[PDB]
């Protein structure tokens, strides 16, 4: 697995991690990118609105074939990755939790750092025609989060 790629002062910070999560890595990059800079509470309200389908996540790198969404500002293609968003909500539940236990105002804290890393693949195999089989793998993702005091 990963370790925190950025330094964090324990006195003014809260940490959180997700390990070997079987969800789309491509969706995770997009979510991380969008929630960075936002307040922990803003991020929760945002991701819940994505799950509901009222807010699209901008797909800037992994956008091939993706249809344009009007609510996406400054860009064109976006989607509503609910599985990966639900996993990010668990990351923000853990962070705000760890934050409150330390005496901080968890919800009001800024997302200083959030990044997803492809930690591996859970391998699978799918039988194809002509007596041959090809890969049918699941991405295993890790994601780090550093909540900072405003």
Q: Where on the chain is the footprint of Na ion (CB under 5 A)? A: 73
The residue count for binding RNA (CB under 7 A) is 41
97 counts as binding RNA under rule CB under 7 A = yes
CB of 11 to RNA, least distance (A): 11
Stretch touching Mg ion by CB under 5 A, among 17-25, 45-53, 63-71, 140-148 = 63-71
139 counts as binding RNA under rule CB under 7 A = yes
Residue 26 CA to residue 81 CA, distance in Å, equals 10
Q: Give the contact letters, 25-54, x = binds to RNA (CB under 7 A), - = no.
A: xxx-x--xx--x------------------
The residue whose two tokens read 């009001």 is 108
Residue 133 CA to residue 124 CA, distance in Å, equals 10
Query: Which residues have a Cβ under 8 Å from the Cβ of 31 and sit 6 or more positions away?
Result: 47, 57, 81, 84, 85, 88, 116
CB of 139 to Cl ion, least distance (A): 5
CB of 54 to RNA, least distance (A): 21
25 counts as binding Cl ion under rule CB under 5 A = yes
Residue 115 CA to residue 150 CA, distance in Å, equals 20
Q: Are 122 and 137 contacting, i.e. CB atoms less than 8 angstroms apart?
A: yes
């Amino acid at each position: 697995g990963i370790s925190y790629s950025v330094e964090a002062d324990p006195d003014t910070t809260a940490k959180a991690m997700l390990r070997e999560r079987q969800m789309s890595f491509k969706h995770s990059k997009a979510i991380a990118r969008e929630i960075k800079g936002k307040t922990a509470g803003e991020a929760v309200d945002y991701l819940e609105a994505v799950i509901e389908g009222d807010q699209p996540v901008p797909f800037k790198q992994h956008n091939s074939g993706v249809g344009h969404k009007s609510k996406v500002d400054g860009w064109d293609a976006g989607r509503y990755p609910e599985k990966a968003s639900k996993a990010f909500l668990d990351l923000l539940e853990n962070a705000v939790g760890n934050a409150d236990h330390q005496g901080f105002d968890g919800e009001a804290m800024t997302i200083k750092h959030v990044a997803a890393h492809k930690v591996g693949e859970q391998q699978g195999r799918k039988p194809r025609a002509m007596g041959r089989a090809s890969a049918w793998n699941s991405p295993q993702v890790d994601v780090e989060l550093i909540l900072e005091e405003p």
